[PDB]
Amino acid sequence: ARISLFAVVVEDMAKSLEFYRKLGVEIPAEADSAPHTEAVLDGGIRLAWDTVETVRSYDPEWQAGHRFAIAFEFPDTASVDKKYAELVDAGYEGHLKPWNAVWGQRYAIVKDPDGNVVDLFAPLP
Amino acid sequence: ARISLFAVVVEDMAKSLEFYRKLGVEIPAEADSAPHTEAVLDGGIRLAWDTVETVRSYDPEWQAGHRFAIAFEFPDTASVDKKYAELVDAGYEGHLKPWNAVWGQRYAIVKDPDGNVVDLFAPLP
């Protein structure tokens, strides 16, 4: 597994991107209308933004909730289920069990010991 | 300018070469550990493989992204800059402006109208 994205949850996409542009982050043109935006970092890791609306479409429990998440990519979809089960029978908090997400990925969410959101995912065939 | 290589981006070098060997492609011994592998075709054109890791060391935007590229060789390094500028002021997508690459070439990347990656290169003196 590899860390693929760090994500922040934003109330207003345009206001958040305006700030990170001031710190030199290279952010796609016209991403102010995006529900989800990504900027590319050295090595290929991305910084991502998701609006509150976006997050609540699959994690309705969110209340201002994590304001960030770490997303790990896995080599295949069964590996997500497998790691999710590995972490939960180890005693960690399973927040949302694995599902086929509308954006094309096997996806699952656990919480680390400090309440942080960790996403587990792989692309759908 | 001459087409020098066709390249595919692979998740696993050994798995990809195992397949093309079954189709008679003559692939160097021990290339399974290579970050970059080439096989020679009639006329001198090569088929190349690059791991995802390799690609991301200079094109961090890659996400499973082009799964192939066409590479054109130029007679000198200034010609790469010149063709890159020619293509971009014509309206085509410049993806990575010319740079001196660690593997010994003046290198640039544009995208064709269908989003495909086209590499422009010449050997460094």
Residue A43 φ/ψ region, left for φ over 0, alpha for ψ in the -120 to 50 degree band, beta for the rest: left
Rounded to a whole number of angstroms, the distance from the CA of A81 to the nearest CA of chain B is: 21
Q: What is the resolution of this structure in A?
A: 1.5
Rounded to a whole number of angstroms, the distance from the CA of A47 to the nearest CA of chain B is: 11
Domains and CATH numbers, chain B: 1-125 (3.10.180.10)
What is the chain B residue with the closest CA to A74?
Answer: B11
Contact, A46 vs A39, CB < 8 A?
yes
In the structure encoding, which two tokens stand for residue B123, read together? 């050997």
User: Method of determination?
Assistant: X-ray
- SS3 track for B14-70: HHHHHHHHHCCCCCCCCHHHCCEEEEECHHHCEEEEEEHHHHHHHCCCCCCCCCEEE
Contact, A125 vs A109, CB < 8 A?
no
Torsions phi, psi for A123 (to 5 deg):
-65, 140
In the structure encoding, which two tokens stand for residue A76, read together? 């295949």
Task: Report helix, strand or coil for A124.
Answer: coil
Select the residue of B11, B57, B61 nearest A40 (Cβ to Cβ). B61
What would the DSSP string read from start to end of A60-117?
TT-----SEEEEEE-SSHHHHHHHHHHHHHTT-EEEEEEEE-TTSEEEEEEE-TTS-E
Select the residue from B12, B55, B56 to test the A interface by mutation, using most A Cβ atoms within 10 A: B56
Sequence-distant (6+) residues with CB within 8 A of B53 are B35
- Give the C-alpha separation, B17 to B7, whole Å: 13
Rounded to a whole number of angstroms, the distance from the CA of A46 to the nearest CA of chain B is: 8
- Give the C-alpha separation, A64 to B84, whole Å: 47
Looking at beta carbons, which residues of chain A come within 8 Å of B64? 123
Torsions phi, psi for A67 (to 5 deg):
-105, 5
Q: How far is CA B113 from the centre of its chain?
A: 18
What is the chain B residue with the closest CA to A27?
Answer: B61
